[PDB]
Design an enzyme around this catalytic site. Sequence first.
Site, mmCIF file in Angstrom:
data_model
loop_
_atom_site.group_PDB
_atom_site.id
_atom_site.type_symbol
_atom_site.label_atom_id
_atom_site.label_comp_id
_atom_site.label_asym_id
_atom_site.label_seq_id
_atom_site.Cartn_x
_atom_site.Cartn_y
_atom_site.Cartn_z
ATOM 1 N N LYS C 193 36.794 34.939 43.638
ATOM 2 C CA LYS C 193 37.995 36.634 44.499
ATOM 3 C C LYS C 193 37.016 36.400 46.016
ATOM 4 O O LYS C 193 36.855 36.083 47.115
ATOM 5 C CB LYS C 193 38.210 37.273 43.764
ATOM 6 C CG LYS C 193 39.634 37.161 42.971
ATOM 7 C CD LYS C 193 39.175 37.611 41.941
ATOM 8 C CE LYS C 193 39.186 38.972 42.200
ATOM 9 N NZ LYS C 193 38.225 38.904 40.474
ATOM 10 N N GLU C 218 33.299 47.658 45.421
ATOM 11 C CA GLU C 218 32.848 47.145 44.201
ATOM 12 C C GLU C 218 31.843 46.745 44.277
ATOM 13 O O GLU C 218 30.525 47.250 43.591
ATOM 14 C CB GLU C 218 32.922 45.915 43.691
ATOM 15 C CG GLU C 218 33.137 46.839 41.971
ATOM 16 C CD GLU C 218 34.349 45.310 41.977
ATOM 17 O OE1 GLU C 218 34.132 43.683 41.701
ATOM 18 O OE2 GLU C 218 34.977 45.619 39.738
ATOM 19 N N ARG C 227 25.362 37.294 49.674
ATOM 20 C CA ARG C 227 26.138 35.961 49.194
ATOM 21 C C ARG C 227 26.074 35.571 50.774
ATOM 22 O O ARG C 227 25.910 34.423 50.943
ATOM 23 C CB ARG C 227 27.313 36.579 48.539
ATOM 24 C CG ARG C 227 27.012 37.193 47.678
ATOM 25 C CD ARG C 227 27.347 37.206 47.272
ATOM 26 N NE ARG C 227 28.714 37.188 46.471
ATOM 27 C CZ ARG C 227 29.261 37.693 45.106
ATOM 28 N NH1 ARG C 227 28.365 37.735 44.146
ATOM 29 N NH2 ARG C 227 30.534 37.113 44.470
ATOM 30 N N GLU C 359 48.753 44.682 37.004
ATOM 31 C CA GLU C 359 49.324 46.094 37.278
ATOM 32 C C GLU C 359 50.430 46.346 38.202
ATOM 33 O O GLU C 359 51.313 46.866 37.808
ATOM 34 C CB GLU C 359 48.605 46.876 38.542
ATOM 35 C CG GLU C 359 47.622 47.795 37.052
ATOM 36 C CD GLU C 359 46.000 48.690 37.643
ATOM 37 O OE1 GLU C 359 46.003 49.239 37.301
ATOM 38 O OE2 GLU C 359 45.196 47.749 38.398
ATOM 39 N N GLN C 396 54.008 31.411 50.250
ATOM 40 C CA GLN C 396 54.534 31.666 51.422
ATOM 41 C C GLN C 396 55.389 31.586 52.098
ATOM 42 O O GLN C 396 56.115 30.486 52.275
ATOM 43 C CB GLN C 396 53.247 30.708 51.793
ATOM 44 C CG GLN C 396 53.375 29.716 52.678
ATOM 45 C CD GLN C 396 52.283 28.773 53.629
ATOM 46 O OE1 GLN C 396 52.133 30.013 54.695
ATOM 47 N NE2 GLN C 396 52.161 27.784 53.614
ATOM 48 N N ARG C 397 55.986 32.654 53.550
ATOM 49 C CA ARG C 397 57.414 32.454 53.746
ATOM 50 C C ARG C 397 57.384 31.861 55.369
ATOM 51 O O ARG C 397 58.480 32.072 56.030
ATOM 52 C CB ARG C 397 58.373 33.189 53.889
ATOM 53 C CG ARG C 397 57.179 34.948 53.850
ATOM 54 C CD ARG C 397 57.884 36.111 53.903
ATOM 55 N NE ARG C 397 58.774 36.920 52.765
ATOM 56 C CZ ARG C 397 57.300 38.328 52.547
ATOM 57 N NH1 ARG C 397 56.989 38.705 52.457
ATOM 58 N NH2 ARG C 397 58.082 39.034 51.491
HETATM 59 N N1 LIG Z 1 24.118 29.141 39.111
HETATM 60 C C1 LIG Z 1 24.594 30.337 39.614
HETATM 61 N N2 LIG Z 1 25.341 31.244 40.192
HETATM 62 C C2 LIG Z 1 26.151 33.031 40.425
HETATM 63 C C3 LIG Z 1 24.741 33.003 40.974
HETATM 64 N N3 LIG Z 1 25.197 33.701 41.983
HETATM 65 C C4 LIG Z 1 26.601 33.822 41.793
HETATM 66 N N4 LIG Z 1 27.138 32.624 41.189
HETATM 67 C C5 LIG Z 1 28.418 32.822 40.150
HETATM 68 O O1 LIG Z 1 29.157 33.008 41.931
HETATM 69 C C6 LIG Z 1 30.376 33.952 41.306
HETATM 70 C C7 LIG Z 1 30.842 35.297 42.342
HETATM 71 O O2 LIG Z 1 31.575 36.322 41.630
HETATM 72 P P1 LIG Z 1 32.920 36.568 42.240
HETATM 73 O O3 LIG Z 1 33.755 35.471 41.484
HETATM 74 O O4 LIG Z 1 33.233 36.660 43.626
HETATM 75 O O5 LIG Z 1 33.550 38.035 41.429
HETATM 76 P P2 LIG Z 1 35.487 38.320 41.202
HETATM 77 O O6 LIG Z 1 35.102 39.496 42.542
HETATM 78 O O7 LIG Z 1 35.457 38.519 40.141
HETATM 79 O O8 LIG Z 1 35.344 37.194 41.291
HETATM 80 C C8 LIG Z 1 30.031 34.533 39.780
HETATM 81 O O9 LIG Z 1 31.263 33.775 39.036
HETATM 82 C C9 LIG Z 1 28.286 34.297 39.304
HETATM 83 O O10 LIG Z 1 28.848 33.393 38.771
HETATM 84 C C10 LIG Z 1 23.613 32.483 41.088
HETATM 85 O O11 LIG Z 1 22.658 32.526 41.619
HETATM 86 N N5 LIG Z 1 23.401 31.377 40.807
HETATM 87 F F1 ALF Z 2 35.898 40.383 39.123
HETATM 88 AL AL1 ALF Z 2 34.708 41.279 39.927
HETATM 89 F F2 ALF Z 2 33.901 41.546 40.423
HETATM 90 F F3 ALF Z 2 33.977 40.391 38.812
HETATM 91 F F4 ALF Z 2 36.318 41.273 41.455
HETATM 92 CA CA LIG Z 3 34.498 41.164 43.605
HETATM 93 CA CA LIG Z 4 57.308 37.772 58.118
#
Ligand SMILES: Nc1nc2c(ncn2[C@@H]2O[C@H](COP(=O)(O)OP(=O)(O)O)[C@@H](O)[C@H]2O)c(=O)[nH]1
Ligand code: ALF
Ligand SMILES: [Ca+2]
Ligand SMILES: [Ca+2]
Lengths: 418, 421, 418, 69
Positions: C193, C218, C227, C359, C396-397
């Site tokens: 996400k 978060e 990132r 939710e 999507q509309r």
């Molecule tokens: N291999 C590797 N994977 C990573 C690293 N940092 C983050 N990830 C992965 O990239 C993803 C990023 O988190 P995210 O999906 O944005 O949180 P969300 O809001 O729940 O979707 C996670 O699934 C982490 O496992 C890293 O340093 N190495």
């Molecule tokens: F699903 Al997450 F941070 F792990 F929003």
């Molecule tokens: Ca997140």
């Molecule tokens: Ca519209």
Amino acid sequence: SIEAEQAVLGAVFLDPAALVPASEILIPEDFYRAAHQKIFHAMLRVADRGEPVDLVTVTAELAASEQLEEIGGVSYLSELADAVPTAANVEYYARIVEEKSVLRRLIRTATSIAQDGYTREDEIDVLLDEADRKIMEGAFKNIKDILVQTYDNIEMLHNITGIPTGFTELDRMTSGFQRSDLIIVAARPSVGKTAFALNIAQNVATKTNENVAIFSLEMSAQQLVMRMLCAEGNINAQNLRTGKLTPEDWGKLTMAMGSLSNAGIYIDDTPSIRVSDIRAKCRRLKQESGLGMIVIDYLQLIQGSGRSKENRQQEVSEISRSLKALARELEVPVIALSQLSRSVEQRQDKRPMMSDIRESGSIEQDADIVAFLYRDDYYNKDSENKNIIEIIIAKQRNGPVGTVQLAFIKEYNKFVNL
Amino acid sequence: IPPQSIEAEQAVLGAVFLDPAALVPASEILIPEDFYRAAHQKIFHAMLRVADRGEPVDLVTVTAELAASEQLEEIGGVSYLSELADAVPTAANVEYYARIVEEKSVLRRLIRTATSIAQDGYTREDEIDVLLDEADRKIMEVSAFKNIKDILVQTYDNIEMLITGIPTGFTELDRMTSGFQRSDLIIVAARPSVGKTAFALNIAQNVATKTNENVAIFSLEMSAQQLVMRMLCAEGNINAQNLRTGKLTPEDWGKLTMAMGSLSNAGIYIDDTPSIRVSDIRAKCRRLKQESGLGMIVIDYLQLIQGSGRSKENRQQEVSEISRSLKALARELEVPVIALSQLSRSVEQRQDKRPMMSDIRESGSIEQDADIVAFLYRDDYYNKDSENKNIIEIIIAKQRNGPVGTVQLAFIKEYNKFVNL
Amino acid sequence: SERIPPQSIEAEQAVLGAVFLDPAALVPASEILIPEDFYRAAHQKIFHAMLRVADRGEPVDLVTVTAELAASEQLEEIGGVSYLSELADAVPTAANVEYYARIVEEKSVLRRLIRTATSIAQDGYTREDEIDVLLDEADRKIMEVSQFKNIKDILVQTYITGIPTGFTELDRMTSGFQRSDLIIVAARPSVGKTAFALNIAQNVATKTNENVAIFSLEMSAQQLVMRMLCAEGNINAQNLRTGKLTPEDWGKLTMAMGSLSNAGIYIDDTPSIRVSDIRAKCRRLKQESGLGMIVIDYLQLIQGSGRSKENRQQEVSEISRSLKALARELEVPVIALSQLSRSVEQRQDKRPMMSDIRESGSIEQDADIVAFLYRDDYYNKDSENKNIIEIIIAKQRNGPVGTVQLAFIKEYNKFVNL
Amino acid sequence: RIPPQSIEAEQAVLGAVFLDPAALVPASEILIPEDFYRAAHQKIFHAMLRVADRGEPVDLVTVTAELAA
DNA sequence: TTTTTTTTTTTTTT
Ligand SMILES: Nc1nc2c(ncn2[C@@H]2O[C@H](COP(=O)(O)OP(=O)(O)O)[C@@H](O)[C@H]2O)c(=O)[nH]1
Ligand code: ALF
Ligand SMILES: [Ca+2]
Ligand SMILES: [Ca+2]
Ligand SMILES: Nc1nc2c(ncn2[C@@H]2O[C@H](COP(=O)(O)OP(=O)(O)O)[C@@H](O)[C@H]2O)c(=O)[nH]1
Ligand SMILES: Nc1nc2c(ncn2[C@@H]2O[C@H](COP(=O)(O)OP(=O)(O)O)[C@@H](O)[C@H]2O)c(=O)[nH]1
Ligand code: ALF
Ligand code: ALF
Ligand SMILES: [Ca+2]
Ligand SMILES: [Ca+2]
Ligand SMILES: [Ca+2]
Ligand SMILES: [Ca+2]
Ligand SMILES: [Ca+2]
């Protein structure tokens, strides 16, 4: 503020070893009343000699300075004497006087901050530092201390730790039946739950000197006692319930009744109780006679505290909690019998696992120990070695997991060692 | 006679009517309430109100806005707004005067919160510790978007720094994770009697004894006495059954004597009150960090924590909330928080009984909130005969630092001990 | 009381204006609108003339159009040449006619609905004759407010409008990321996400010149920037975490920092905001710098306006409304990240459907566009073709529904095209 | 039309607590605060139990400290 | 309205 002040000063004229805690907790200034300030000072002033501290030496010390008349007469010091509930808890009056002291110290430093707010409009950051600092001016157990208690506890270890069940192999594995444990004994219907629990109750009540309370929600007190008689005396249950007794059976019964009288087992067969009720009754029995074990014929039969007839899984989730908490509060093992869901039956290996416990998983979680009963002859009509019954100890956070074997002579409502 | 540079206030408002690009610094520095005079409050508000359209801000549009509410007559006439224009010759150093107005604002905010503390001193004579806390907290609070240029610098300077990481002492886990990072919520979940507490206790020891950091443990199920007895056994390799009987061999007492030695200077703080709210946990930790500094918080068992008042709510929400509170606690204290969790029986139903995130008991928000989710799995928990007994998987199902994966350790149960391989 | 037939004759002018400015803008305009869609009698006639001249085709400019309007009795009826001149100066550019045409069209549909609804009620009192057929007409008359490829249309023969994301295949399907849209990106935890949202934010803030506001509830700003750095420069996150950087990594970082500086991305990491707060902040950033996109790191983490802690489904139902309305007010796409309920992990196929949005169902219903992220390798440890991630465009509309594929190199916090 | 009550007996209970106070144990086994008719006694017997849960224990001082709290 | 955990009757999964 006051009156707790009087209670402190009072206790000193009453004890006066009560001055030691008092002064560890308070300085003279902590007292609000000008007069008490002076008196408590005089008390400490006389202690430094040390005189020691009584109604005479104190008034001698107060007259030695201009102060005896300022604090009321000897007659006020006399009233202080007569003005304390119990000498013993100065600690708790002192702590009131102390807490009030801290309150006005807070008020006083807060007002002086506000005061300074209007004046020293000169250097903002150091003023905000002063405010930070002026307002600052354990609830965790420290490990050093626990180690000592844990040591001294291992020390008290000349000569099962443990309320002994009388089943050697189980006792080896468990060592009681420990104070504050929740022990779950679950098994399919008519497998032997109650039988097992009752057998344990007997061997505890007759072999040891401890009292045991049994809450039976399904069977009557009568039926319970009749199961214990048969087991105590090896009298065939069918005979017993017909009155069709052999001449030696009448002997066996006479003996059985004898030993079960001085047994001290308290039975409550009210079919619907809440845990609160159980707690209340046990609290009172322990009060006047002392308690050792609690047995409950059967956890999911207990009934909920008001939360409306909630998601039933939660309802028992809660009962589970309450029972463990009860075992914890009364410092006594609590054996709660449990049913199992039909899930186990759908299987090949009919031996139960923790998941099988009926109605709520929280029971596996809360328990200090989970015992399953399994009988091969319960499922096989022909089964080789009939009277054998596994006591599967699926969970314990004292220690070891494993299976133990006993014989369950059903004709006698009796479990026996091998 | 409250603190007020009613001269400098005019200088700010004036500069806006003169520039009016001067409204940008002005508003970055001040909100309407910062002004002492009731009238200026209203004017500076109108100025911003008009800016949000944006009109923009001159002597006309402002009076148009002030008349659009009942306020134009309240603030003096158009004739007062005219005076404001003429009060300061040039509109350069507004920054100066704005910061005077602001500083005076802070002063009376301070005075006001100090007086209300004193005020409350006489009234709420009920709960002393939570009151003294408010004073502490209310005085700090007298201290929009973060610009990226600035963050980039802090981040470069931070990377300039080179386990990062409070080290667990389990090599393979530490390689994967590098601590146990400040502000992370670490969930350790697994079926009952699998090894949750054992694992958490082992980590607490290796942190408290190998490093110099303090660790707080909140045990809601077991007593302090039982916890320490687990650590003793693990520290000295003393068989737990022997230890709880007092049936110790001559060399066992030797083992116990050293175990006790090292665990003394260990500095691990244990709270075994069986019912706390998160607020309570927070309060206790805040104070321990105050006077000794904190490194880790361990909580034996998240769903055992109890809710803040919202009535006995949809239980899923109640824990949903506890979850958030914990993460927020870890965030506030800048310290890793390890929360043990139970799992629903859904996993038991499955063929292979390695847990997935869905299995975490009672609320899905826990998967979500966690910085990192660790499952414990033991083949010998299900197989009575199982080949290679003491092996235990540490399944790292979730982490947003980085990598996901499984790590293996040995769990010698007789010693309440986890070991490296 | 006073009922004003719904119209936006600002937006009407913006359409006609864009045509005099472009005039390739007449193509989208007419794909979306017929002359009758316009409310003002005059615009009707003008836009008709515009099409009349295009059928020759002349083509369409301020001259030819007035020539065509005078060719019928109409040039004086629509205001002068001086009105046609004003229409030109309506908009700065003929950029995004598509947007304003769709407003004019949407308003047209609204009053068509109102009109057929009132005529149904009208007929309710009159034709009290034939109940069942009156119900058929009502059915049928309400569908006809909405306006299957033929075999011939399918024989065109064998053998961005739009803030651009930088993901070609997504952009083709979507064409931005349109002003006033609410875009929901939902997926299970740790699926991608935030990663995906951040990637979009960078490519917008660096490739375009628009500003983007990100609200992270978060993660800290620090973690966000780290990132982006990794994704901008292809620096391994673990390395970057540790400071354990190779000599060329330093080069990559030096670069990444360079480009991210002039990037203009405003980050707000206050962990608890209400939508009102979000609105306020954005309103102000748009005021003084202009805004292009708003990203929110997560919708159910936002907190409610006072209504008491209401039926939580309503609380988020409300947040949902507020966000769409904010997107509408600021005329800017709003990307709201969402969680999903666990119900997907029951299915043997783990691809989300709209129902799964956690939710409150109103989120499906408020969104202009709903995107799910699905990863085979999230579930399969061994999965063949790892780094692949589906972007399921479930709603999507604007137009087309479908799935798009990208690669999500996790070590680099990076999404890439294929 | 005057509700069954026995204030004399209510006072006698509360009295005995300030006198003993191991007398609080039987008292609470038998009664909850709501059993008392007088609004005031309700509050007092509540405070008594509230202080016992610490436990302080229960005397004329600690009780008034809890009631002022 | 929804999310969660439990027991127990159905169908259909190569
Ligand atoms: N291999 C590797 N994977 C990573 C690293 N940092 C983050 N990830 C992965 O990239 C993803 C990023 O988190 P995210 O999906 O944005 O949180 P969300 O809001 O729940 O979707 C996670 O699934 C982490 O496992 C890293 O340093 N190495
Ligand atoms: F699903 Al997450 F941070 F792990 F929003
Ligand atoms: Ca997140
Ligand atoms: Ca519209
Ligand atoms: N053969 C025989 N068996 C008996 C007699 N009385 C009791 N039992 C057995 O003992 C068992 C009692 O089981 P019980 O402990 O009450 O069932 P639970 O509480 O659900 O585990 C029954 O299944 C009977 O088979 C008897 O007189 N004769
Ligand atoms: N074999 C053996 N196992 C033990 C002993 N003492 C404790 N254990 C085991 O260690 C485990 C305790 O796990 P624990 O972490 O407390 O349970 P959890 O918190 O729900 O995961 C159980 O599986 C026990 O059987 C012992 O003396 N011998
Ligand atoms: F039949 Al039962 F406990 F007596 F299951
Ligand atoms: F044994 Al547990 F929570 F299941 F301590
Ligand atoms: Ca039974
Ligand atoms: Ca545990
Ligand atoms: Ca992950
Ligand atoms: Ca709605
Ligand atoms: Ca749904």
